[PDB]
Design a protein around this ligand. Structure first.
Ligand code: HEC
Length: 464
């Protein structure tokens, strides 16, 4: 085909042999699932503003650009592999933990640090959570995915990237400890509650990759396949601390997995049959129940027996993974945003009966709160109107307040300081910002300019 030859001559230098990546990102069909071919075409011709991807309009014509786009989105004749041997060969260890002191090199409170993902230019900022000033900034792997995870004591932070790279960062020494490429297209990762294991959930290959959390060395590649042998992508991996287990959502088979690690490296799944494909898990506070979205509403499964105990039909497809729990009149309640409709659904835990449907302007994506806050903070991140953060009173279940940090720009995602006194909102824009708010007065206290900040993650709240 003409695309391949054009690719070798003009592209392989940076995007690598087989489109696996190199200087530039991986360019497999899975890698480009969020990039429409017309957008890829414009990137190839004119480049990406303010990056190392320059335009090629002067080197190739319309037919050559179309040929290249067609090649990038075409499935290869055989699926690319990423073996145990590939994984081990990719490990690097610039600052092994054995060689580093175990003392914070800074004066900021280690438990109030924010890890801030700067997705516009693929950097990470480490923020002093009391001064709201950076103590470190470093370039990350391209297109971080899934939000960072922490070691149990909050000293170490683990990043996963779209194209399969895992990064271990030591917050005390402000240094990259190790990196490894666990797959070719990665969904997210999870850290065991005893701090020993990293479990990586991959789309490509369809597998789980188990790493030693101290140096990102390979422990075992676990192919994702149901009991009948049918291959599957991993949708997401989660930690269930009271069960000392990983819980795995599988994209393409009627199974979900629990991998216990109390007795050692979690290499053997306990398989639980599900009636329908189930991903985007949420866990009840006691981790006895799993709330998932089925390909057909919400499904409540008991983890031990795997029995389906209740079904909750809700408008549109609710984003159960982002839902949160709190006590309202001395009884657990659960609230979830929605991907296609503009509503916040509130469910009663005791009976799994819906309590109230709070109507909003548009579909949202994020939800957060704090023991010290009387509101649940959410958004309409996915709607046509999307510059407002909504504060839903935990008791009245109504939008009590609204926050509009940058009128006209996408506002979304909220994280608090460890004591809940301040809330940090992201304006997801090239001319974006991290906006600090007093969580009780609700007034803007500070604003940090950033290129498309996405999530920020408070050590204290993430490990508490
Ligand atoms: C190195 C100097 C490169 C060469 C030669 C080519 N590309 Fe590239 N490309 C490169 C980088 C560093 C990046 C990432 C830029 C960023 O956002 O930080 C890219 C990006 C792309 C993309 C977008 C991928 C995405 O995930 O959004 C595409 C579609 C792409 N590049 C295609 C492409 C083609 C077809 C090339 C030869 C014709 C080519 N690139 C050359 C680095 C480099």
């Amino acid at each position: 085909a003409p695309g391949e030859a054009l690719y070798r001559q003009h592209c392989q230098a940076c995007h690598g042999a087989g489109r696996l990546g190199g200087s530039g990102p991986t360019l497999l069909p899975e890698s480009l699932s969020r990039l429409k071919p017309a957008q890829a075409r414009e990137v190839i011709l004119h480049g990406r503003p303010a990056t190392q991807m320059a335009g090629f309009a002067g080197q190739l014509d319309d037919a050559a650009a179309d040929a290249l786009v067609a090649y990038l989105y075409q499935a290869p004749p055989r699926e690319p592999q990423w073996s145990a041997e590939d994984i081990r060969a990719s490990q690097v260890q610039p600052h092994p933990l054995a060689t580093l002191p175990s003392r914070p090199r800074f004066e900021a409170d280690p438990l109030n640090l924010f890890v801030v993902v700067e997705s516009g230019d693929h950097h990470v900022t480490i923020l002093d959570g009391d001064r709201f000033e950076p103590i470190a900034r470093f370039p990350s792997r391209y297109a971080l995915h899934g939000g960072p995870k922490f070691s149990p004591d909050g000293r170490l932070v683990y990043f996963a990237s779209r194209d399969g790279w895992v990064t271990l960062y030591d917050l005390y020494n402000l240094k990259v400890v190790a990196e490894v490429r666990a797959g070719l297209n990665t969904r997210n990762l999870a850290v065991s509650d005893d701090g020993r294991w990293v479990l990586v959930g991959n789309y490509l290959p369809g597998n789980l990759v188990l790493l030693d959390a101290r140096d990102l060395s390979l422990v075992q590649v676990i192919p994702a396949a149901d009991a009948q042998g049918q291959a599957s992508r991993v949708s997401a991996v989660y930690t269930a601390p009271p069960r000392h287990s990983f819980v795995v959502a599988l994209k393409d088979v009627h199974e979900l997995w629990e991998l216990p690690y109390a007795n050692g490296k979690p290499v053997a799944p306990k398989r639980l049959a599900v009636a329908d494909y189930l991903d985007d898990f949420s866990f009840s506070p006691d981790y006895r129940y799993l709330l998932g979205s089925s390909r057909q509403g919400g499904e409540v499964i008991e983890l031990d027996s795997g029995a389906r105990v209740a079904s909750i039909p809700l408008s549109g497809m609710p984003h159960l993974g982002s839902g949160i729990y709190w006590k309202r009149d001395g009884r657990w309640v659960f609230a979830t945003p929605n991907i296609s409709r503009g509503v916040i659904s509130v469910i009663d835990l005791q009976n799994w009966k819906p309590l109230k449907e709070i109507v909003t302007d548009g579909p949202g994506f994020f939800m957060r709160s704090h023991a010290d806050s009387p509101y649940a903070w959410t958004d309409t991140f996915l709607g046509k109107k999307h510059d407002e953060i909504l504060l839903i009173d935990k008791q009245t279940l109504e939008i009590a307040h609204r926050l509009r940090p940058s009128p006209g720009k996408v506002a979304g995602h909220v994280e608090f300081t460890r004591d809940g006194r301040y809330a940090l909102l992201s304006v997801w824009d090239r001319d974006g910002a991290l906006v600090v708010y007093d969580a009780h007065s609700l007034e803007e206290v500070k604003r940090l300019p950033m290129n498309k900040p996405s999530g920020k993650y408070n050590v204290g709240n993430k490990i508490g």
